[PDB]
Design a protein around this ligand. Structure first.
Ligand SMILES: *CC(=O)N1CC2(CCCN(S(=O)(=O)c3ccc(Br)c(F)c3)C2)C1
Ligand SMILES: *CC(=O)N1CC2(CCCN(S(=O)(=O)c3ccc(Br)c(F)c3)C2)C1
Ligand SMILES: [Cl-]
Ligand SMILES: [Cl-]
Ligand SMILES: [Mg+2]
Ligand SMILES: [Mg+2]
Ligand SMILES: [Mg+2]
Ligand SMILES: [Mg+2]
Ligand SMILES: [Mg+2]
Ligand SMILES: [Mg+2]
Lengths: 10, 232, 232, 10
């Protein structure tokens, strides 16, 4: 399971 | 470019329509045309640019990972097709990263402007170098990783000087830098200490949450927590 | 074409990789290159062709519907941007439908071959004329609707002569023809009687389910039921 | 709510 980066938010 | 004849405002409008239509390549093209007008982007327009290109490269990254996993499993215990198609997707992904980085360098990354825009664009430069580094090899790869690190570090320095510790760009930048340290640089301790320092300092100054912004801040704080739980 | 130099078998392999990568435009291009080799497609290859193009046109249809709904709401109680962008998506959608219909006419629809392939391709011709008819206007539109109906009717006649009433191509064809009647032809009664006749006759001869096929059959039977519940 | 047509299965 890979690290989580900043997601999309709009 | 293909968007040269359209008014900036019309390009912004159409990028918003393309987002509602989930047409993210169109969205990215509209926003590239808007950037090429040579005027600054607002916070809202930066979001359009970011969402469009992240969606495009995100689908490419996900495809590349699927194909790479098939390729590696076909290289343990026959034809060229998997490698060829992985190379095809890889080349398109690098092309999108080159486009974004070119926009950043040609148009967006400036000496002046507010800390938000300066930090955001340097963060974005670090991100797209990071995506190039996920698929890179050899002499190309060392220069990519240094490029990502230097962009992230310049953004970090500005963010720590000019933004509150709950600022969502500062938090998102720190989250992404820590991912770089863990996944790209092979520096788990650097990743962990940055994620923990970022979370703790946001909590220590929780009163600095902004009322137009606090949902984004607390979202990233939880993502730092998830990564720390994963990494420990 | 762009796939002219690749071996048929390599094109099939890559379409399967593209499906696993959720790269449906690539998938469609690989399958078009495979069709253009001029050999028949197997059942499994028809599935690859169908899945690829349905995914592509499905995303275009969904986008078109979003934009059209915005366009109609901006035409009840200001600039050209919504109409322009809807026209842009519409033109791409028609281009994909033209490509599929050209493949059907140039390569796939033949006099001989088994009933499955003949019914499947005629069904596909009806479907992509139907998708053109969803966005059509005026003199263009009347000829499109007739074209869809005639393709569906020829497929229906063959299917009723040559296939069991539970056959999933026959069921899927009847399901899609009934949708045409309801949504395109403005013939709710024709749609309802076809959906009910299809469901009832599949149930009456339920013993004809095929063991490599029965999950698909019973899936379409339920979808006929849902449409009938919606339509009554 | 629009009518349902044949879905993708693979
Ligand atoms: C005002 C400004 O310059 N902004 C807001 C941003 C929109 C585009 C992407 N980001 S970000 O990458 O800093 C980011 C993305 C998601 C979340 Br939940 C977040 F907190 C920060 C910010 C640029
Ligand atoms: C064997 C053969 O010629 N086949 C199987 C098919 C694969 C492509 C699409 N179809 S279909 O459009 O007839 C269809 C699709 C989904 C379902 Br659940 C179904 F029952 C039938 C059949 C062509
Ligand atoms: Cl390839
Ligand atoms: Cl447009
Ligand atoms: Mg302008
Ligand atoms: Mg061997
Ligand atoms: Mg390479
Ligand atoms: Mg060949
Ligand atoms: Mg007015
Ligand atoms: Mg038109």
């Amino acid at each position: 399971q890979r690290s989580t980066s900043t997601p999309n938010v709009h | 470019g293909a968007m040269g004849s359209m008014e900036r405002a019309s390009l912004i409008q159409k990028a918003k329509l393309a987002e509602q239509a989930e047409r993210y390549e169109d969205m990215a093209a509209f926003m590239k045309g808007a950037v090429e007008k040579g005027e600054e982007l607002s916070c809202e327009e930066r979001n359009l640019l970011s969402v469009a290109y992240k969606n495009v490269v995100g689908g490419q990254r996900a495809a590349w990972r699927v194909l790479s996993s098939i390729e590696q499993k076909s290289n343990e215990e026959k034809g060229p097709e998997v490698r060829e198609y992985r190379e095809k997707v890889e080349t398109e992904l690098q092309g999108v990263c080159d486009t974004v980085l070119g926009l950043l360098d040609s148009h967006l990354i400036k000496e002046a402007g507010d800390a938000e825009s300066r930090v955001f664009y340097l963060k974005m430069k670090g991100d797209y170098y990071r995506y190039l580094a996920e698929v890179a090899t050899g002499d190309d790869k060392k220069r990519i990783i240094d490029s990502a690190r230097s962009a992230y570090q310049e953004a970090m320095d500005i963010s720590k000087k000019e933004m509150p510790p709950t600022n969502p760009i500062r938090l998102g930048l720190a989250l992404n830098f820590s991912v770089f340290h863990y996944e790209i640089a092979n520096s788990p301790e650097e990743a962990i200490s940055l994620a923990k320092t970022t979370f703790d300092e946001a909590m220590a100054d929780l009163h600095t949450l902004s009322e137009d912004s606090y949902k984004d801040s607390t979202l990233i704080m939880q993502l730092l927590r998830d990564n720390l739980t994963l990494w420990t």
